[PDB]
């Protein structure tokens, strides 16, 4: 049902693009800006970022609470957009590490942890600081 609605959207976007028309989904610009910000972040802050990624190794036994503890330090005295990009890059690095160590199954678990931590901690800050649209225009 959600699956069948995504198939429809995908097909119609493809067909409209093929005929010279762009049917932009609401989050397209946000997803692009965040891919670009994460790339720039990992290129600018390699050493500092390695100090953050060194704080957590996820195994099949790991509970959300261990992830939440490390991310709570990142946001202990508040949220900013740079720390949100760090959060996304951190989750990326944990997924790459998981696949390196033949624990592919943990990628969907880490994804669910990130979505949980966004819902609980970051989305309420986002809504009072301009939304994802502000993040898009700040990254330029």
């Amino acid at each position: 049902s959600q699956s069948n609605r995504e198939l429809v959207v995908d097909f119609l976007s493809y067909k409209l693009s093929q005929k010279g028309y762009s049917w932009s989904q609401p989050m397209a610009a946000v997803k692009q800006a965040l891919r670009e910000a994460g790339d720039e972040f990992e290129l600018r802050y390699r050493r500092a970022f390695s100090d953050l990624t060194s704080q957590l190794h996820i195994t099949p036994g790991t509970a959300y609470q261990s992830f939440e503890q490390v991310v709570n330090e990142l946001f202990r005295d508040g949220v900013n957009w740079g720390r949100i990009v760090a959060f996304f890059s951190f989750g990326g690095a944990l997924c790459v590490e998981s696949v390196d160590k033949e624990m592919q199954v943990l990628v969907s678990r880490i994804a669910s942890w990130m979505a949980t931590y966004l819902n609980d901690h970051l989305e309420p800050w986002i809504q009072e600081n301009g939304g994802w649209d502000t993040f898009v225009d700040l990254y330029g």
């Binding site: 972040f41 600018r44 802050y45 500092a48 990142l74 957009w81 740079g82 720390r83 700040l138």
Partner: peptide, 10 residues
């Protein structure tokens, strides 16, 4: 409070 090198990355 500034704690990370990315704290002024927009």
């Amino acid at each position: 409070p500034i704690r990370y090198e990315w704290d002024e990355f927009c």
